[PDB]
Ligand binder design. Structure first.
Ligand SMILES: Nc1ncnc2c1ncn2[C@@H]1O[C@H](COP(=O)(O)OP(=O)(O)O)[C@@H](O)[C@H]1O
Ligand code: ALF
Ligand SMILES: [Mg+2]
Lengths: 393, 113, 165, 99, 186, 113, 111
């Protein structure tokens, strides 16, 4: 119940490579940051945690099965001993300590499972390691406090939960962060908090989601409609945010030596323009859209089902390296860059679409290009110009 | 309604010896054909039948047989896993082989009537 | 949903707005179905007119010193149908015949365009009500009624605890 | 009382001037001249199917206003569906079935 | 939260006779004093109308009823027209909208900080009402002369501005306000 | 407002010997005439006055008069049952007979001016 | 968001000798036109751009520039009060002089 001591906290400015494209590009979580994943039932809260527990650049993962399904825990101790890292040969189970207290298990033990995990996450943080703590799910810990509060005959606050729910959550997430561990060595350890929230009916106005948003800087808001359309991971790009995107943008721009923040912002500008356009399409019609605006919806369509969608069970897409993300986003952006060049020169909308059918397929399959063949993606950029030039003439 | 329904453990039920080898491939292509078919059936009421292309009216026609023949079986009609998959394969023949983009060429040449 | 403060008074006001919204949606689509009826008879007439005059005007153009002779004879009412306003040498002989034929073609083709424009205004009027106004209210009423019940449910709950003091 | 303007090639629309019609003879040039007489309260603006394809934006915006009517006319060579395309597209988009 | 369903306000309105309900939507639009005309009321409005009818010897109780009716008719129109839209608004109904807009910005909208709008005397409150009411009454006769809506406004922007600064007229220069009745007729 | 107001014992109170034979019929006639006249006035706000027919213009004129002349009587105005029913007939005399369907022609030809 | 925001001590802190003579009249004129311009934009996105009235359509652009240029200035821009009030008139010069009813002729003429 008392967090381990450190020298001082440091600003988490090192973006974590999760392999998930909707995360590492638009809503990045920093090493030591806090990220909440609130979503309705079956929206993909756990699956996101299983991918992060297996594709993160961390030295140790701590998975807390707080009030979740018992089958969700047996699946861990079976698949993780087989997830072999092809470099070190050590299984993922060798790099992870998980704590499990399912739903039908004692209710008070849900609180103990949370504080047990973060304490272990702090014990290895002091060794200079980067530890990731997974809380699945924090909404069941909050029920144990509300259950305990009703037994103690205490005054309930918001929706029955005890009045001290804001402090208990703030006391937890502040125990994370990139720290200077104790000792004369001045070593840098970090704790990255990935906690899942299970609101009733998917309503984020519930107490535990709001108190979590106050103390964290990353919000991966899952959407039920996306989980129904087989859009996975079901991350809502309009509502989700990351306060690190600006700092990550500075760091990310430097290593790439490319204006990557201006490509993410431009890709975001297309997706926000898609939302404003879809309201007019349902009101007036898609045929009532101009050649430039209808191009924006098609370019935004390429951002959705080619970059944001990621299957968890498919090997080609389950992981995407940092260098692969740049080649993919550059090809999608180069499409609209030369397409607006053609519309301003006199080309029509459908003239560019029907004349680029073959090229438009190569982008949709770019997610399945192995890391040892990344030259295929970047070659589509030069290929697009050749196809565009003949179409213009 | 199979659109909002889901089975999260069906993977440990599909595949050979637990079901017909085509189970996983047929299931996912049937789902995408219905979702597009219902979506096309919605376009016919909001914007009329003239705003849908020739391939859109086929998916809309497929969704009618899917709900009336595949799902509609009767509360006293016990199908088997064989008859279920055979009834689903017969329904996929409406859609062209180029539209069955989620089934590999292998299972297509083996079961498609 | 539109931003609002949960109150019993706001619930009944949004309840009355939706009932008037639902009936207004019924009436604008009736105007949409109606316009589709007078447009369809006029459009088919225009299509047959336009086709006939087009080919006939071209064949007139097809059959058509010549510069000096053409140097030296210089010769729309507003009618409201429904909710829309509506406006009201052998080759030389063919030209004068076509010239009346083109004026009626002008005060008819332009009429169909004004029918299509008002059809489109009403269409998007109807569409917004079904896809934005009425659904925003329907979800709004759900949240309003939700809050009031749990509030009174939690309000009587503490009153039982205060009674024990 | 409003005036009538005609746009097209010299050979095809020349006799229209014998009745007191503003007969005129590139995209940006027709756009500025058509909007000029449109601002001068012109009744009907006849244009050929060849000059109108160069300025579809001008027609698309101008057709909405009731006072000036832009009508497509054939030339000495003919048309290629301009009337039908304007008519049939307004049908399929506002009715729901071709007639 | 502006919730007048609280016991404090509810118990208050059971013993008071006048209710000056303030509205947030009007206060944010810089409408002042932000008194909700539909929502507010006064149990003294009947007897004060009888007194005011006698002091200036004018039918004030019923010309006040006409102003309240216009503001009541707007709320009925505005609520049926928010969602439907005003494009199919009849020419006669549109005049009432421009009558209500004149009542709201010219008479009800008043700022305390400006020395002039702070006080309106009984002679000024009548003259401004006489201009706006006779306008809506005689311009009704203009629209019933086979006139389109667009027109009568466009040719009355000069009168309609003198109506705007009617609050600004000093108490001595009231003849300025009463002279707007003849120009609106002409 | 008479639309949400109801009287659970008005049937015995009104009739021959009670008030007059035309009490129950004119009540049900002016009741439906107001709801139709009120919806017609709203139709003039949604669809404009052009959508209102010659009959709808009378219904909108009825509601407006019924609000201002029938219910609006004054807090110091005692109207006898005889003066009340006759006023309802004058307000109902605006609509043609074809509009008045609830009232049988035996009594409709007795009091209608 | 300056529509629901308010300051109650400012009337005595503005005017000639404190900031600018005409601050109060511009200020009052700004909010009213922004409220209607925002009201018109919320209509453009629902009923269409063309459906909006031409007078309101000038306002629809009034509120657009009053958000991207007037309000949007960055977290490191120290603009002066003279540059702020001069910017405000430039946003009022769009609307015709007849629609500026809460600025007197004396303040309208001098600016
Ligand atoms: N990233 C993903 N890729 C593929 N499928 C997913 C993904 N996320 C969720 N799903 C699907 O959604 C189902 C439920 O996901 P899960 O994370 O267990 O939901 P919850 O939000 O309830 O934790 C899974 O069975 C899986 O099939
Ligand atoms: F399957 Al869940 F939150 F609904 F883990
Ligand atoms: Mg889960």
């Amino acid at each position: 119940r008392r967090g381990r001591p450190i020298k001082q906290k440091l600003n988490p400015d090192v973006p974590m490579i999760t392999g998930q494209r909707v995360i590492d590009t638009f809503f990045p979580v920093t090493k030591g940051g806090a990220a909440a994943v609130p979503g309705p039932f079956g929206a993909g809260k756990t699956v996101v945690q299983h991918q992060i527990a297996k594709w993160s650049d961390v030295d140790l993962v701590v998975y807390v099965g707080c009030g979740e399904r018992g089958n969700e825990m047996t699946d861990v101790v079976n698949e993780f001993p087989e997830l072999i890292d092809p470099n070190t040969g050590e299984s993922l189970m060798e790099r992870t300590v998980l704590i499990a207290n399912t739903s039908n298990m004692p209710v008070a033990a849900r609180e103990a499972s949370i504080y047990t995990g973060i304490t272990i996450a702090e014990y290895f943080r002091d060794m200079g390691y980067d530890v990731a703590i997974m809380a699945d799910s924090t909404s069941r810990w909050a029920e144990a406090l509300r259950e305990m509060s009703g037994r103690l005959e205490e005054m309930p606050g918001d929706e029955g939960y005890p009045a001290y729910l804001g402090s208990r959550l703030a006391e937890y997430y502040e125990r994370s962060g990139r720290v200077i561990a104790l000792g004369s060595d001045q070593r840098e350890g970090s704790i990255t908090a990935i906690s899942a929230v299970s609101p009733s009916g998917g309503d984020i106005s519930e107490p535990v989601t709001q108190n979590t948003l106050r103390v964290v800087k990353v919000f991966w808001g899952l959407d039920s409609s996306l989980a129904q359309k087989r859009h996975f991971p079901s991350i809502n790009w309009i509502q989700s945010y990351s306060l690190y995107s600006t700092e990550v943008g500075r760091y990310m721009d430097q290593i790439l030596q490319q204006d990557w923040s201006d490509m993410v912002t431009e890709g975001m500008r297309i997706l926000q323009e898609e939302e404003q356009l879809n309201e007019i399409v349902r009101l007036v019609g898609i045929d009532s859209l101009s050649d430039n605006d209808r191009l924006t919806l098609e370019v935004a369509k390429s951002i959705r089902e080619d970059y944001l969608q990621q299957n968890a069970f498919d090997d080609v897409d389950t992981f995407t390296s940092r260098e692969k993300q740049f080649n993919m986003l550059k090809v999608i952006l180069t499409f609209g860059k030369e397409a607006r060049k053609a519309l301003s020169l006199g080309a029509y909308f459908n003239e560019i679409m029907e004349g680029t059918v073959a090229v438009r397929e190569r982008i949709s399959r770019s997610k399945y290009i192995p890391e040892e063949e990344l030259a295929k993606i970047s070659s589509i950029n030069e290929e697009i110009k050749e196809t565009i030039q003949l179409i213009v003439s | 309604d199979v659109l909002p329904s889901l089975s999260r453990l069906k993977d440990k039920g599909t595949g050979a010896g637990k079901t017909r080898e085509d189970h996983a491939a047929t299931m996912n292509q049937l789902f995408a054909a219905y979702a597009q078919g219902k979506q096309a059936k919605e376009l016919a009421v909001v914007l009329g039948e003239s705003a849908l292309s020739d391939i859109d009216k086929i998916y809309a026609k497929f969704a009618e047989r899917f709900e009336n023949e595949y799902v509609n079986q009767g509360f006293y009609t016990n199908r088997t896993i064989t008859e279920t998959l055979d009834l689903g394969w017969e329904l996929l023949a409406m859609l062209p082989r180029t539209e069955l983009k989620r089934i590999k060429d292998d299972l297509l040449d083996k079961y498609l009537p | 949903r539109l931003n609002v403060n949960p109150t019993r008074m706001e619930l009944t006001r949004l309840k009355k707005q939706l009932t008037t919204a639902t009936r207004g949606h019924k009436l604008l689509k009736d105007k949409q179905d109606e316009l589709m009826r007078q447009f369809i008879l006029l459009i088919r007439k225009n299509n047959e007119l336009r086709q006939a005059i087009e080919k006939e005007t071209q064949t007139a153009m097809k059959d058509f010193f010549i510069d000096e002779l053409l140097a030296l004879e210089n010769v729309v009412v507003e009618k409201n149908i429904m909710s829309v306003k509506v406006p009201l040498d052998r080759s030389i002989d063919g030209f004068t015949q076509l010239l009346p034929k083109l004026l009626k073609l002008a005060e008819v083709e332009k009429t169909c365009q004004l029918m299509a424009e008002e059809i489109e205004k009403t269409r998007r009027r109807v569409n917004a009500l079904e896809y934005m106004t009425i659904p925003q209210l329907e979800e709004t009423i759900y949240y309003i009624k939700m809050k009031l019940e749990e509030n009174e449910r939690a309000e009587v709950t503490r009153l039982i605890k205060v009674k024990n003091m | 009382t409003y005036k009538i303007g005609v746009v097209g090639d010299k050979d095809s629309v020349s006799p229209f001037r014998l009745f007191g019609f503003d007969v005129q003879h590139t995209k940006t040039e027709i756009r500025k001249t058509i909007d000029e007489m449109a601002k001068n309260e012109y009744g009907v603006i006849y244009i050929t199917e060849q000059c109108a394809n160069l300025v579809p934006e001008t027609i698309e915006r101008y057709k909405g206003q009731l006072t000036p009517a832009i009508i497509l006319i054939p030339s000495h060579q003919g048309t290629l569906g301009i009337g039908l395309e304007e008519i049939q597209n307004s049908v399929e988009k506002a009715v729901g079935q071709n007639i």
